[PDB]
């Protein structure tokens, strides 16, 4: 008799007025001429072939096969065809490469982040490998010798699926992930054959990694003569496999069985003499990898806001199809008010995100003012923790908006919450990033540069007045209030950005 | 080399100063004589044999076996030994029965709810069957003929596992759960044999049920020739199986694959001429079933707060074992402030819950004033939506407090979020209960009785002023503000209750 | 250190001297011109893309999805991409269609059976659907009205994957498969709409079926008012789905969890008013369906022998790679003698199979003598039970030849035994076919025609003497000796055929 | 409507006339007084609580958990409660210990083998650990120092579940299992703490083992100064865990996913400095472990015949419940003749098995004549390969006797074939044991002692005449015919034993 119609998606570029308004403000005419048709195309893929491949990957999670039938240690990771297909899309659509083709100045990074914004929610979180790939490319561009750059960058930035590499970023060990000072991976001097000029061999265990689907990784290790703690750490480049395709003295222990991001392989592994090449100098590892973090944290933000948009698209569509007590849900004043509130949060998030992406683009093309560089540094952790918390809140409300159906996995709706919860954890928790914000304040007059910016652009906001009072408090009291400070700034900046983009 | 020590629990009665303070206020001396050692005993089981049985049930979810090997339709649901054991615990510890032994007046229900509070978080949500069992006993006690009470109550209230029955409550159909007016299950006059005086046969589909875990159920159906909508619905009692152990014309379609509560069988089923007995008169179904809803909503609340306590117990213990940047997490001011904030929320929730539990007890022993009965009616939906939202927020924060480990299933931590999300959905969503609160106001001056209660018991405040101003608004403006109104009231009653119990 | 190299296959046409000798004897020059390059091509696919697709299908068995997420009964069966691909191969390589292109007279069927012989062992038993498809085409060709032939034959005999249909054959019910007289499926007159001229609606349960893999099926049912037993049964044609792709009143109960053939969906289903079209007259069902049985039994035989060849190819290759006590296994006299014995059995089986395949071809093009038609009738059940038993014996010996590895599933070797066991059970057990042989003798002097054939074609022998003595026995003594009689005949015909083909 | 009744078992002692006749011949009066009531009791357990525990273990196969949630390598093997329960039965019922309590002389081993015969088919192959436990106890009794015997034998032979140990026998490596000469496990001298007087540390990989549920194991290793090949191998004792329960430098790679014996943990593991104690002298390992093989091979035989009896009990019962073509299966002459033939094979197997068990008992109490010791040596491999092949043949026929149902796993019938196939592989393949027979012939005039025995007890058998002609052939021709020779002897001896026991 009666059966409920479930939610349906529509082209994600055409359905997103906020994104279109933002790009009209941030993209110059020559950029729009190329970007808008590309984006409209990607928006179509997001609800057609990508959507199916993502569903396929989520329904067939990766499997570790440590041994072949005759006892050879192979450490294969079996993935779905859909997962492999989503990697190919990332290459051919230039989801990473677009940022590094800086034809459009600062707008190149904006255009790229718009591609990521459409791609990510339909990628089964392949966007995580892409974040680390982008971060790795920038790090190599900034710090690596010309020969290493010549070998690796054409792969990371390739638009050809056959040559495209992704990178892992292997920073977490059992001792800590927030704090890497306890890193126990040793780097012994290495003299031998290599295809990339390896200088050391690495011995240690990496506790969360993206396993072996990536061709390279960056990691931290402690050379034989180095000091303890963070300043005995150097940055290292390594390749996972040799010519023939066998792992370079890398052993996978197991895959993590995770709350969400289930299509994404996350492994514990051991480096057992893995050949590697030091980048930068002894002791410089932590501060050099800091430029990988800035990019991955802005990826995380954009992916979290794309996730919000996907949850709300499903909720909006359902609200026009589900009836209760005589009315469609969208026509119940309380239900509509809840949706409106979530959409308002979304608008803050997407404006804030692209405001920061623009700042990032400005810095990457050398056109950022001293003030803009400081703003980028302060706002990046704030953006990340802000959009992450919002994406979890919104995903949970959307699960509840579907009622009982929201709690049953074959509707696809519980995944929204399971996946969203990752965003406030990966690349730094709310508290770790709140403290990074407080430490950004202590350098280059950054607290005052932020204050001047807020006074210049919206002196009369309710957030600024409260924020000023908090910023006068003691050191440890500011730490205790660090979250409140972060969200006041995030909200103040979101409002400024929304006005700037006419949202 | 280094391995992190994971969280450990300790006796849940001794470790809970809040619960002890509340019980010292609410239980008279004679009740304490019986209750406190029972609770200390149950608090030990909660972290020993129950914890093991719950883990086993969560690791071995129920499985539907529709057919035996020779083609007989049997619709068996295979469960773990741990799940069966937790059912035995519910009987022998009197997790339901304690409330119906009313020697301690209003305190009998308070004592029972303290038992539930300790039991639920170590029950793999067997507490859900218990809520529906308790609700069914109350409905039968209030409305059923003497012969039906004599048959069924000794099973529902038994302390002997061999005799104990649980009940299902089958309201939800595909057309709706919030709104049951679209109920399509027909009740035809029945003149066949039964063991319980069946009067009708039921034909329809019940879309979320507790499957065949229960020996009986209450449900709604539309008798032949009855009016459309909720006004044509009657309340029906049925038993699931006959003498031989065969399902009484009930077919299980499948089990739901759920976000959480995975040990709990939740089934879609069809009634295919299921004999049933009408309770009460034609047209009275929804109003009679409200006494099941009120009890299950208070169970939900107590279970949500027990869940919060469990999440925080794990976080607190971990915070004394995990180090970062040289210090235990508990010694980082921001982490400590976050924990303190979550604990403050916990204290509001438990005080509010037992305040309402005491009111329920008062009404059940006939000692509640007219105003207190009205308070109970108004505060029950508020308590439910209030504690549910807090439980989800706190579980998500606790997941993030464990960092990466928090996101990995074998630590047991992701389950906190997956399970918590259920609390804001079953037995009513936030918005549906917000509206139930608003309809309660429009009956017997309930809004005015509520307001006098808040004014008498708490000083003037901006929140109070804000609430009074909201309560005068338009029909539709009150609806738009229904959530804000509910949380304003919830916060006020929580403060009042915390003061009363010296928390 | 040391790791054993596992078995490898090579092109299955080039590696099979027996098959090549048989085809040089049975195929005329014009047939060889077409067939030999086609077969060499298929022999390559059998060890490349087909082998990969079969492994994938065996590793991802079909899954029944009875309900969509919103409660619609859809009864989907999800299969692997590999399974779908192997269906495409069957069409494009003309694994069925080749027989019905009778330009080469009796040799068209011989050529088709050579294709099946190479295809089947790398098909994850998709060859089972093909047998039933071939059988259905023959039944329709022989018995169906022109309009039904015009509709259906272009699908069954299509070489285009977009147009190709397979058929199921639904005979078995819970009461019996060997004996269909207890068939309980009723056929009521039907006056509704259909796309194929349906005359009845079917109501009953079919206990082993190929589920919804097929677009059509043949089945038996009892029309209203018909006699009891097999004499009341008629043959029915039905299509599984309508225009919209919805099942035509067919419900799938579940898939069988089988010892082997795990990639093949085998379902229990209920016909719940399924429109169907009677073929032939009332009471003629069993006799008309015999032309499906005869073809499927010869398919079974060829598939059993292809299975034997696959098992021995693996054993032979392994025997040239595995060492024990200083020598390759092939150089141990006892191991070599065991292999030689299994190979001698293989040669009997393949010669016997193609001998009967040639007879089938002769009859299908109208060129078979009266005696040869009778030989075909007698030898078909014998061939089937004979090759089946040999396939099981040889598979078990090959499992043991691999030693411990033979018993471990990821080597692929245990599957040889699990799959082989099916061959002696479907389309008739050893005893049921032994009795079919005995009833065939009692019709048209068939026993005497058989005996003259053996005497003319083979010298006198103790086996021959033993057989003649058995063929004169009592009604019940012949039954007790039915197996011995069948294997005596099978061995005699195998020797005669081997001599004829110079094996 | 119609549903088939499935097969049911009855007390396995009372239902087995062949076993009872054998024990009346082999057990003296004082032995029968104790044994027969014990056996009747075990026969009841075999079809009640053991049957359920075995089903439970087969439905919940063991799982390897290499890491705890915090990264500690624990290599846990999770087993079902039923598996644990079947171990307890083995201890309390004295399934091993009974043989070593030699109150009844040679009849003690017979009584024990009768217990094994009833136990094994209902043990989910826990009888395999018991075989290795028995073998280990005998080896220690024969060759170990008094102090080691004092420590270990009370555990192996315990009737108390709390103190009972099982043993593994770790002889197979990747290089070979039939041939152990390629053993690569090194034994370095060890000086340190041990609880059992360890003398060496072991380094190597064992390719098939019974994992970590056993407390001890025997294995072969090559000391630092030893020769290559088999005479550089010494026999070693080791314990798997220390005081606290952690593995003694043993790492489990994975469990095998096997054709059958699915309840039994079979693991690949590495010895990584595992402390061990040499038993016997350097170079003596292979010949000392030969006395473990003799016991495990007779266990295998008895278990294989118990397996035959179980398959036939199910088939016999089904044959009295399934009808086809108007008659119960048992009443169809061809079906009855097939059953009779299988039962005749069973009678040969059980008589042969207990004839050899009696010989074993005679040798263990020092009462075997020179001729009887030689007969035991020659007949042991023959018994093992004979009963194994018969059990596979009979299991396959029984699967087919159940028709389609026989091929579907939830009937329990396919397991009969999957499990039976192990018997011809473990502890030696048919060919390896056939060659061991031929080598037994070359010592102590053994071929002539066997001939004299056959001439004395049944000169007129058809087997002897054929056997004599084969035994005159050349060395390599005897090897080529080794299987035929083995089965002729097996059949000749089975006939002699059947006459001796009045079967």
UniProtKB/TrEMBL annotation, chains A, B, C, D:
Cofactor needs? FAD
Xref: InterPro entries: Acyl-CoA_dehydrogenase-like, Acyl-CoA_DH_CS, Acyl-CoA_Oxase/DH_mid-dom, AcylCo_DH-like_C, AcylCo_DH/oxidase_C, AcylCoA_DH/oxidase_NM_dom_sf, AidB_N
Please give the PROSITE patterns that the UniProt record associates with this protein: ACYL_COA_DH_2 (PS00073)
Q: Does the keyword Magnesium apply?
A: no
Supply the EC number(s).
1.3.99.-
Indicate the segments forming the Acyl-CoA dehydrogenase/oxidase C-terminal domain, all copies: 283-439
**At which positions is FAD bound?**
169, 171-172, 177-178, 322, 400, 404, 429
Q: Which Gene Ontology MF annotations are present?
A: acyl-CoA dehydrogenase activity; nucleotide binding
- Domain Acyl-CoA oxidase/dehydrogenase middle as annotated: residue spans: 169-272
Record's superkingdom? Bacteria
Q: Which keywords does this Swiss-Prot/TrEMBL entry list?
A: FAD, Flavoprotein, Nucleotide-binding, Oxidoreductase
Adaptive response protein AidB N-terminal domain: from which residue to which, for each copy? 10-159
Regarding protein family, the annotation reads:
Belongs to the acyl-CoA dehydrogenase family.
Name of this protein: Probable acyl-CoA dehydrogenase
Q: Which organism is it from?
A: Bdellovibrio bacteriovorus (strain ATCC 15356 / DSM 50701 / NCIMB 9529 / HD100)
């Amino acid at each position: 008799n009666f059966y409920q119609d479930g939610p349906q998606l529509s082209n994600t570029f055409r359905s997103d007025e906020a994104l279109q308004k933002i790009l009209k403000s941030l993209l110059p005419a020559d950029a729009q001429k190329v970007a808008l048709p590309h984006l409209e195309h990607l928006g179509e893929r997001a609800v057609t072939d990508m959507l199916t491949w993502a569903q396929e990957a989520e329904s067939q999670p990766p499997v570790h096969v440590p041994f072949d039938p005759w006892g050879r240690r192979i450490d294969d990771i079996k993935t779905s065809h859909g997962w492999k297909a989503l990697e190919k899309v990332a290459a051919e659509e230039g989801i990473v490469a677009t940022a590094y083709d800086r034809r459009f100045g600062a707008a190149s990074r904006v255009y790229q982040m718009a591609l990521l914004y459409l791609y990510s929610p339909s990628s089964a979180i392949f966007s995580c490998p892409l974040a680390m790939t982008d971060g790795a490319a920038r790090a190599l561009e900034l710090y690596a010798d010309a020969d290493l750059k010549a070998r690796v960058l054409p792969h990371l930035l390739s638009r050809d699926p056959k040559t495209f590499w992704t990178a892992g970023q292997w920073m977490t060990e059992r001792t800590g992930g927030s704090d890497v000072s306890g890193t126990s991976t040793d780097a012994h001097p290495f003299t031998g054959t290599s295809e990339f000029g390896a200088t050391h061999s690495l011995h240690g265990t990496k506790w969360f990694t993206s396993a072996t689907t990536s061709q390279m990784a960056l990691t931290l290790a402690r050379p034989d003569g180095a000091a303890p703690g963070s300043r005995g750490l150097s940055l290292f480049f390594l390749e996972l496999r040799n010519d023939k395709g066998e792992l370079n003295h890398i052993q996978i222990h197991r895959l993590k069985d995770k709350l969400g991001t289930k299509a994404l392989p996350t492994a514990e592994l051991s480096l057992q003499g893995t050949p590697a090449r030091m980048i930068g100098g002894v002791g410089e590892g932590v501060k050099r990898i800091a430029s990988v973090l800035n990019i991955t944290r802005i990826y995380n933000s954009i992916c979290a806001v794309g996730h919000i948009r996907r949850a709300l698209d499903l909720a909006q569509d359902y609200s026009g199809k589900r009836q209760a007590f005589g009315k469609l849900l969208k026509d119940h004043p309380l239900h509509k008010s809840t949706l409106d509130s979530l959409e308002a949060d979304f608008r803050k998030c997407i404006a804030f995100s692209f405001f920061v992406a623009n700042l990032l683009g400005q810095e990457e093309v050398g056109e950022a003012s001293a003030s803009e560089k400081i703003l980028l540094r302060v706002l990046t952790p704030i953006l990340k923790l802000y959009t992450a918390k919002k994406s979890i809140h919104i995903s949970s409300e959307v699960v509840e908006m579907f009622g009982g159906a929201g709690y049953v996995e074959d509707t696809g709706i519980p995944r929204l919450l399971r996946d969203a919860q990752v965003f406030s954890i990966w690349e730094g928790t709310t508290n770790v990033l709140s403290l990074d914000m407080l430490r950004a304040f202590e350098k280059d007059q950054a607290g005052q540069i932020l204050e001047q910016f807020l006074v210049l652009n919206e002196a009369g906001s309710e957030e600024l007045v409260r924020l000023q009072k908090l910023l006068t408090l003691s050191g440890e009291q500011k730490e205790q209030h660090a979250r409140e400070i972060a969200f006041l700034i995030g909200n103040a900046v979101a409002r400024i950005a929304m006005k700037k983009y006419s949202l």
